[PDB]
């Protein structure tokens, strides 16, 4: 599924990501934009044979098959990705775990990603 910006912003809010571990909602929308272009089916293989899955491009090297205790297919649906991301952002480097978030979103006016919805 390709989410619309506002569609995804609403869904992430309903799944409890607003200020989760201190990260405002637009952070999460922004991270999805630059990770998957809002495509829940996005799959990209890493150099090392692992693959990044789903709307937030969660990496099978660590998180699924498995630190989120989930098959990676669970991350490719029109909840699992949110629950795993919540574990990831509690894990060690916060949202810096998503390099694209760090380079494109961190410390910007991320409220823009939810304005007009």
């Amino acid at each position: 599924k390709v989410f619309g910006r506002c569609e995804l912003a609403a869904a992430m809010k309903r799944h409890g990501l607003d200020n989760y571990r201190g990260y405002s909602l637009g952070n999460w929308v922004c991270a999805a934009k630059f990770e998957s272009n809002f495509n829940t089916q996005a799959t990209n293989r890493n150099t090392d044979g692992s693959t990044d899955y789903g709307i937030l491009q969660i990496n099978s090297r660590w998180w699924c098959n498995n630190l989120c205790n989930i098959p990676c297919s669970a991350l490719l649906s029109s909840t699992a990705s949110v629950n795993c991301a919540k574990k990831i952002v509690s894990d060690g480097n916060g949202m810096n775990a998503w390099v694209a978030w760090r380079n494109r979103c961190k410390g910007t006016d991320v409220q823009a990603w939810i304005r007009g919805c």
Epitope: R21, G22, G26, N93, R102, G107, D109, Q111
Partner: T-cell receptor, first 106, second 107 residues
């Protein structure tokens, strides 16, 4: 840079009183505000961050409210150990910026 | 929370001296370090962000360097306006956290 406007500059109150400090931001900063307590000669110590999340060891008497451009730090039942300068600092955008502080005497 | 360890705690120096302050982080914080300057009775004033980027109006005598876990603020040719308390602060993770400060006082 984001400009933070903190009031008042100073206040004096009695033990057990409610005290209220305000912090206005020049633009929407969601809830990305730190509240610090600084005692003489020491670094600022974090009390509250984000959407009123209290640091470990901080009494429930401290609470933060607000979002967007309008934030409040309320100290319920002021106690003698609360003597300090309090500061707000936004970390929504780079660079982080401070309000001017509120000196609290008890 | 990330622990920031700042050294020295205090120092005394003369106009024209070089001052060197170190900040270490308990984990890798990439380049996300602020350096603040605080004068008596005033709020901390940001001098440097991203470990080495200078605020407009701050002279190039202030040099931020380092990365990862190891950072340095070097103040060259110390001037009268430079006597103050300096603090490093990481903003890599939430919450931000402060080093304990360095008081830079006149000889």
């Amino acid at each position: 840079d984001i400009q933070m406007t903190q009031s008042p500059s100073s206040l004096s109150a009695s033990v057990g009183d409610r005290v209220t400090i305000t912090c206005r931001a020049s633009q929407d900063i969601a809830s990305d505000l730190n509240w610090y307590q600084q005692k003489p000669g020491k670094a600022p110590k974090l009390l509250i961050y984000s959407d009123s999340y209290l640091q470990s060891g901080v009494p429930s008497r401290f609470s933060g409210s607000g979002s967007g451009t309008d934030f409040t730090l309320t100290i319920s039942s002021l106690q003698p150990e609360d003597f300090a300068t309090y500061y707000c600092q936004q970390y929504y955008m780079i660079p982080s910026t401070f309000g001017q502080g509120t000196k609290v005497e008890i | 929370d990330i622990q920031m360890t700042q050294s020295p705690s205090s120092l005394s120096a003369s106009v024209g001296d070089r001052v060197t302050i170190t900040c270490r982080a308990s984990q890798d914080i990439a380049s996300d370090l602020n350096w603040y300057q605080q004068k008596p009775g005033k709020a901390p004033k940001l001098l440097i962000y991203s470990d080495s980027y200078l605020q407009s109006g701050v002279p190039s005598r202030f040099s931020g360097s380092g990365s990862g876990t190891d950072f340095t603020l070097t103040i060259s040719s110390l001037q009268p306006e430079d006597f103050a308390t300096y603090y490093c602060q990481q903003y890599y993770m939430i919450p931000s956290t402060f080093g304990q400060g360095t008081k830079v006082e006149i000889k």
